[PDB]
Amino acid sequence: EVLLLPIDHQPANVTTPTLDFTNELTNWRARVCELMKNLVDNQRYQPGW
Amino acid sequence: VALLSGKYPPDLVTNVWYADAIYPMYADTEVFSNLQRDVITCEAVQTLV
Amino acid sequence: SFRVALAGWLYNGVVTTVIDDSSYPKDGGSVTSLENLWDFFILALALPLTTDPCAPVKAFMTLANMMVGFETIPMDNQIYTQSRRASAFSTPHTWPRC
Amino acid sequence: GAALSQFFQSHGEVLEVAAGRKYLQMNNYSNDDDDPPLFAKDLSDYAKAF
C-alpha cells in the first residue's frame, strides 16, 4: 500500500485554496530564472546587445 | 505551458468538488471481478505444472 | 409530513420516522454557501420531532460535515473521516466519543 | 486540531516533524578547501524525524 512520487507532497491544510509560493516547483523556476538572469548579465558572453 | 498556466474555478471548496467527482467511479464495481480472474490464473498455472 | 410526524409517536415501536436524504445538504455541503446554511437551519429545526434515536448525532454531524476544512474533531479510528455523510449515523455504534 | 502541515502532521500515535538547518551558509562560503563541512544540514530538508 505505498505509492512513489518524484516530487514532494505536503498535504493542504485549508479547503479553499489560494496562492502562496512556498513549494519546490516555484523554487526550481526561481533558480532557473535567476541563472538565466546571470547568463544574460555578462557582456562577455554576448557583446552585441 | 501547462506548468506555467493553471487556475482553479473562481470560488471552490475541495471536499465538495472531490465528493462529487469520485462518486460514480466507486458506484462502479468492476474492480471486484478481476480478483476471481487472478484466482483462476494462479490455479491454472499451478495445475499445469 | 407534519401530521404523520405527530402520528408516529404512538407507533415508535414498529415504525420510526427519519428525515429524507434529499433534505440534507448536497454532496456534504459547506459553510461558505448560503444555500447550505439555510438547509442546515431548516434541518436543525425539523429534527427534534422525529422518533429517530440518532437524531442528535445527525444534528451534530451535519454541522461537522459543513465545518470540515475549518475546524476539526478527533476521530476514533483511521477508517472514518470527519467528512462522513450524516445519513449513515443512524445506529448507536456510530456515535463518536467527541 | 490546528491544521499546519509545514512543520508537523500526525498519523495516529506517531508524529512526524521536518527537522532542518543545524548549520547556516553565508554569502562568502565558496566550497574552499579550508571551509568547514556542513554535512548537508544547511538545505531545506535533509531528513524527516518521526
Automatic annotation (TrEMBL), chain A:
<protein>
    <submittedName>
        <fullName>Lambda-1 protein</fullName>
    </submittedName>
</protein>
<comment type="function">
    <text>Inner capsid protein that self-assembles to form an icosahedral capsid with a T=2 symmetry, which consists of 120 copies of VP2, with channels at each of its five-fold vertices. This capsid constitutes the innermost concentric layer of the viral mature particle.</text>
</comment>
UniProtKB/TrEMBL annotation, chain D:
<protein>
    <submittedName>
        <fullName>Lambda-2 protein</fullName>
    </submittedName>
</protein>
<comment type="function">
    <text>Outer capsid protein involved in mRNA capping. Catalyzes the last 3 enzymatic activities for formation of the 5' cap structure on the viral plus-strand transcripts, namely the RNA guanylyltransferase, RNA-7N- and RNA-2'O-methyltransferase activities.</text>
</comment>
